[PDB]
């Protein structure tokens, strides 16, 4: 039953490694588990709830370490689906990958803790919380969107910081004397940060007419400037999603891909990797060894380069390049028609 | 090895026609025509751009030797072929039917014969059950 | 006056069932009624206003039950506008629809209550508050937009949660000793959630120099990260409505629809449902039984599939497909013209 | 019933010309030409794709029986015809005039004669006042 | 000096009535003036600042009434630029316009006040505050954008209201016993509204573990749902601005307008309004009475109809319509060329 | 070693003056330096931390003045990379530029301070805070985006201000009697501004039933209206950066640029600036003086005008312009083809 | 008055050629050709669409009376001509030079002779200083 | 100086052919044809638009005197040439190779010979290290 063995192995690799659809369900559950433990840990910091929270946390940590260990083992087992991660050496190389190393390290640390370590318990919780990404996908996406909007974000933060400084200084001047909230400029800066960010604790607020007038004038501006970065980033995220949708609907790379696969197989067949390769040689000789190899490698090169050129179809460039080609072809067609009709008339 | 170097030198000499110490565009054209395919000047300029790197206009012997010394391991095309098979992975799970492989192989671009695509499916799919794993095929060989 | 009967029936079905324009007015009024009732119930939870609020609530619930009952009866009557819902069986099938069942259930429950049930009174109020959707339209729209931006939303929430955890821990370390607000890590987490969400009750806030410094550093980041999901979803909603506007303005499928209507009527005419169908048979015999039936069904199927193909004209796909067709037509035209002029030269 | 099965077999035989146990593209083309309409090779390909499901290039007898055995309701074309009528519902209220119906169908696409269109208008409108309700018409037809 | 008279008259009408550029400066100043008065009124409500605020407010009221009266007089004078409003009857008809009526009645009311009415004065300031729009432009823009996003806004508010109700009820259940903040369900609803809106007064907040846990779970959802409408409307406003930019860049209607002006002048010249019209009569007689009149009026009307049909070329309508026309024209060209070459072959 | 001299000079100018890539790192460090100084100054306003903060601030100011002086000197030296700013005159002309003057005067003022001035210390800190803009880039970007969305921003602020006034007045009427928070209309306005901006200090909040009811009705509207400007500006920023990405990817002006450079050199060669120019004269005499000068000048001028005309390639202007050109030249193509086929038929 | 009614009846009769009680497309084309302007089939289709309202394909006498009896105070063309000017208002202030008016009048669209365009400019500008205000130019006659 | 005034007067006189006091389009066309470059009507119109400001259609002597006597700094072409470089500044750092300068100069638009491109490369790059600086060249050429 090797077929069923490999089918189940590939299915397990798919569900554990990059999941597509309902596989996420499993991951969600795992997350919940970890999350639950984290919450329990918080409840154990409170003295009143220490008993029950720790009682539940012991069981939950046993359960989560069991689950993580079995997941790690079955993941290293399912790694055989990938040809690179095959056998002793392949699976050891998989385990060498840094994130699997971190996983096993956290597992062993938790097992040792269960065999003043509560601080290490929560630290392991946050580490396995960071572990859920495994790719930096969230970090990479945030970084790309921030970099694309770096100038706008910097404008927002810079002007908001200037507004905060100015408003804090002016309200401080207004309120330094007759308001114990604004005793020093540091207190005014704290108030301005808590106000323009819209947090507004209420521990400090202007109480004079000067302070309230200046705060009213500066609030309408500062709150907007401090809320700007969130709006910029959200709109950027939405626009990026829209453009990705358009591009994925405009992949239009089937022909280059098929040509690439054809030429790659041809190059392998011409290559001496296997001594049983003779059918390709018969096919090439029927259409009339090293020269055949060279021409086939050349065809593979051109197919690869065409695939690379077509590997960047974006929403707006596609139509523009298509119309450029169309209009130059139109001009060539009209000039050719003029030449041909002139030749006809010459008769 | 020296034997393979001599074989590649003979290949270059056969490629060379006038004997200028290099391979010119017209030599490429005549060898393509001898193979049976009719080349194009656009195709010839594509060849020159592909191989030549010093921008002289021809292909020399050391470049040919170095280029043939590189196998799939020395091309870093793993992602390229991965995406090439991905484009035709309609579902994205990682399975493509043998019948569709035969259809695409022998009717698109540089088409091959039915027997050659059957051989390709057999080699790519170790189990030979009609379901080819693209990552399997592109990792066993291309990697 | 059956014509007026059916006209009024259709109008009532339109206004009560799926509304288009001013019909919403009526629904709005109904909503207000229910809303008013809900508000009154809240006023009845307060002991001081229990008397007057309950006095008004009795009248308002009599009114709302009367209105809902008459609306239910007239809706079941007006379902005759749909041929699927005609007669005894049609009306009964209509009433079996889950939301009509919920409506009658709420009506009966409220009537029974009127004939410690105030909690059930407000529960029925919230149930009939959910009832106003009748389609899940709001839920479906929110789910679709969330799924489209699922990765960005997850990135925002994940990074914001990491920021919350880190800021809470660091401010707790700063303030554990010199501030009774941050007695336990749970208090710090509560503070961090309340400030990064920008709620800022003020029940907890840092009061030390290092605590305030760390809070200031982490606020500019956390507030933006927690406001991100709202911005992402709002921008996604706006972009979605924009693209829907463009698509509805780019329907451009009238010809396939007309072909479908023609083919459907023709196929029915060939269909043996009625024996009075002879005009189409006469037309077919002039244009020269079972073979005609089959060819008509074939025409109807091709029309159906062409309508299916042309049933997804989007803002960007249509232009690209049209230009691909134009360019291939241009190439075929030029090659055909070259062949024809070559043939002319051959003369 | 058995009589209907015999009628369908006779229809298939009439469609069949060479007698290969199936219906080929040219058989459909010639019957359509006999009807009066000149078919197109792409149109015959569309024919086969619509009916044929196994992808053998021909239409067999059981497939024909299954094809014609589906009535208005079983076709599951409710949404199709509803949206087809909606596209021409300029106001969207749910009414269409008889004159507009005629000016639409009798001049474009699969054009009809006057008798067919007036019969359609009469049948769709039970009341018969010149106003057509597409939902009512399709439900009474396809529901 | 009638030329300079009318030039200054037109300039004053432009600056006072619809302004384009630096004219806004003046309006801003006027706004500032009235705004200042409003602020002064707010300062006069405070008993401590009654003296100084009233002293300044008397002068400011005199100044603003002088300015408004002179502006009204010069506006009615300069309305002669619009030939609809010329002379006794024209100026009276303009003054009959409702908004000028509002202006004059505000002027008269304030003059009478200057000749317990301070509340009436504040009502006058708010009325002349509404007066600045003069068109409903802000209201019209907001209404259009809200209507375009009515479904998304309703989804946001409906789901946010459901979340508010549920969170308030659950936190009330958590906190009813051991928190005087949540004494009744009305208090819980007030808390939920204040926190989900992110206002967070701090007058009420959960203090139990159940209440804080439930509030933490529900806040990440409710704050986003209540911030959604702002994001939706802002993104809609920005997208509308972008589309308007593109469309105004896509006016491209010079030819229909020129044809319309030509035909209008032609009709007026052939129109029997004036007996001195002979140049156009000579032009039409040389190009070979009532028939020419009718045909020229028809030219004017058809030019008007073309003006209306193409009056609104949109960002995406123009390109798609032009390409559809071009493609059908190309098909006609190729079929005509094939017919012509076939005819040539026939020779 | 002049080659390395000028290479290092250009590199230093690039890193200090307009930076492209990793150069920003250096600037960031400088910013941190000044920022640190600023923070230290705040810590020195607090009496408790005055000692240590001032001790560190002395060293930090020595360091920052050293760094700013050396940076100024090396920037002035590296200005020789630009031919305009070369030699004594070019160096002085650079130093005349306003921001260089600001830098030198800040350096001198700080040196003098180091040789009740702490207020001037912090003023210099904010000035050098503003300094690293050097272009108004943030201000220019904000101004452009605000102007583009000026009407929408004004609508948002105007309707929000009306909502604030109305809500404040109504809640004041509700709460004037039995809530010391709302003693005067100014207190109500302060409460409304704090609530609608979502700051929610909690120093004032309604406590009556009608006051809370009105506040609840008005908050859902006012909070959205006051959050609108942030969303509008953020979405505008995101759309602007998206279109800038598209346009920068659609530069497509190589041909006009090359023609401009060629004709510019041609004009210079024909011009009598240098008498050693004879290669261009030989080229022009072989292709058969003052007439050649004028004709080459006009070639250069037409190249400049074409460059200016093509200097505005935009995301949508290019495609529509090129399609209009294609349509008109295809009309000419078809009319010419018709004429030519008619001529062929004539034979 | 009755004199104008008789004049319009004579105009209709001159419009009529065969004398069927109405004006057909061919009659309008013939009179246009007599004037000098060659008609077009699309132009005649526009004629019929503009004039007739009941959808009969011909022009009636009462229809012509209603058409020609509407003056600029009843045409509702105030905003229309305003926008027509505004499309050519490059600055948007509301002024256009006389030379530009002559160019647009005699070069683009339905061209006229110099005298007619000078008369148009003179009538538009009461002051006659070469500056035209579209407000007045559409309000003192066209309103 | 009066010598340059006389030289420009002689240049204008040679420019004029019929001798109407101005330069017509046909004179420019024929002088261009004799020069070697074939003119185009669109090119003639563009040059005329470049010259005239009063809108007459000819070229008068004072305009030729005034415009030809200005130095590179009198046209504010600095930003124009800077952008011209920028378009071909692929990296944006501010450096380009001399080989690409020769390729672009003598293969695009108004091409020149090898000697002229070498001369401009040498003049633009004082150090003569092949790495030409755009800002220096434009500054000592235009500014």
Numbering used by the authors:
A (entry chain A), C (entry chain G), E (entry chain D), F (entry chain B): 70 to 184, 195 to 367, 537 to 595
B (entry chain F), D (entry chain H), G (entry chain E), H (entry chain C): 6 to 148
Give sentences copied directly from the paper behind this entry.
Because PIP2 can potentiate the activation of KCNQ channels by enhancing the E–M coupling, to capture an open-state KCNQ2, we solved the structure of the KCNQ2-CaM complex in the presence of 1 mM PIP2 (KCNQ2-CaMPIP2(-), where (-) indicates that PIP2 was added in the protein sample but not observed in the structure throughout this paper) at 2.7 Å resolution. Unfortunately, we were unable to capture the open-state KCNQ2 structure with the presence of PIP2 in the sample, nor PIP2 molecule was observed in the map, suggesting that PIP2 does not tightly bind to KCNQ2 in vitro under our structure determination conditions. The low affinity of PIP2 bound to KCNQ2 was reported in a previous electrophysiological study which showed that the half-maximal value (EC50) for diC8-PIP2 on KCNQ2 was ~205 µM47. The KCNQ2-CaMPIP2(-) structure is similar to the KCNQ2-CaMapo structure, with activated VSDs and a closed gate. In the VSD, the side chain of Arg210 (R5) points to the gating charge transfer center formed by Phe137, Glu140, and Asp172. The activation gate is closed by two layers of constriction formed by residues Ser314 and Leu318, with the shortest diagonal atom-to-atom distance of 4–6 Å at the activation gate. In the CTD, HA and HB helices are wrapped by CaM. As no inter-subunit interactions are observed in the CaM, the conformation of HA/HB/CaM is likely stabilized by interactions between the linker connecting the fifth and sixth helix of CaM (H5-H6 linker) and S0 and the S2–S3 linker from the VSD. However, in vitro the binding of PIP2 in the activated VSD is not that strong and PIP2 is easy to dissociate, which can explain why we were unable to capture the PIP2-bound open-state KCNQ2-CaM structure in the presence of PIP2 alone (KCNQ2-CaMPIP2(-)).
Among the neuronal KCNQ channels, KCNQ2 and KCNQ3 form homo- and hetero-tetrameric channels and are responsible for the M-current, which contributes to the stability of the membrane potential. Each KCNQ2 subunit contains six transmembrane segments (S1–S6): S1–S4 form the voltage-sensing domain (VSD) and the S5–S6 constitute the pore domain (PD). The C-terminal domain (CTD), which contains three helices, namely HA, HB, and HC, interacts with the calcium-modulated protein calmodulin (CaM). Here we report cryo-electron microscopy (cryo-EM) structures of human KCNQ2-CaM in complex with three activators, namely the antiepileptic drug cannabidiol (CBD), the lipid phosphatidylinositol 4,5-bisphosphate (PIP2), and HN37 (pynegabine), an antiepileptic drug in the clinical trial, in an either closed or open conformation.
